[PDB]
């Protein structure tokens, strides 16, 4: 839906306007979970090859953990940027069309007559 928007670069993973956003924490819970999945991938790989699950290939286990965190950080940056753009467009569109989004003056419950439904 957003692909044809103004100022859209083709096949750009991280547009330069994304550098105004705060970067994710390196201990972001989503990045901690990514590294945990990489650790599980290493253990599952050991199991499938009939190796000692925790002991074998700590170098292979470390690469699995680091790759998941490394990839996840940059993907999380791109996902943060796409959500920020979505809000930038939504609110900007709301301002250009104030007739489609009126401020609805709500009434207090002193004036509203809700029906009473007796429980019995």
């Amino acid at each position: 839906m957003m692909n044809g928007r103004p100022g859209h670069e083709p096949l750009k993973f991280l547009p330069d306007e994304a550098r105004s956003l705060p970067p994710p924490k390196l201990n972001d819970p989503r990045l901690v979970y990514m590294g945990l999945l990489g650790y599980c991938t290493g253990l599952m790989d050991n199991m499938l090859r009939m190796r000692p699950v925790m002991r074998a290939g700590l170098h292979r286990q470390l690469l699995f953990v680091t790759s998941f965190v490394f990839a996840g950080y940059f993907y999380l940056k791109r996902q943060n940027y796409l959500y920020a753009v979505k809000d930038h467009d939504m609110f900007g569109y709301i301002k250009l069309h104030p007739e489609d989004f009126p401020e609805k003056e709500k009434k207090t419950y002193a004036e509203i007559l809700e029906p009473f439904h007796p429980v019995r």
Partner: protein
Amino acid sequence: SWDKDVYPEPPSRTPAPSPQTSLPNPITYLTKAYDLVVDWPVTLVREFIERQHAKNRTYYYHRQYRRVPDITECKEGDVLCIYEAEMQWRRDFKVDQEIMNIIQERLKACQQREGENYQQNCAKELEQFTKVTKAYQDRYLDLGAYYSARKCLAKQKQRMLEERKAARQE
């Protein structure tokens, strides 16, 4: 102790006594033995306990809640205002439950106290229990398991509109 105004008790009126027979009253002697063997040692233990309490005297306070805007003054969909108003209404509903319990406690105490005279001498406690029960039913009857300030208000407005209609026809 307790508040004699919240939990009123009539003053006692115990006769003389005026014994006629010459036999000794066993209850009188058993009570004297009881007051020595049982009552007296128990009081000393309690007085020792109360002396320890006064050396470590601490205090506690009854919490006060300032009033917040009622549900009537909340804009619909205003969850922040509805929440505080609803929490206030739950606090009041709870206090209403204990007021009912106090009035029933007075009623039960008076019936026992009056005995064979309860059908005449409990008139004021029975009338207060009747009034306070009418008022309770008007606030809270038929609200259901999901009772709330919004439902209580809708129940009140429904009753007010019927009262107004009946008065207007008059």
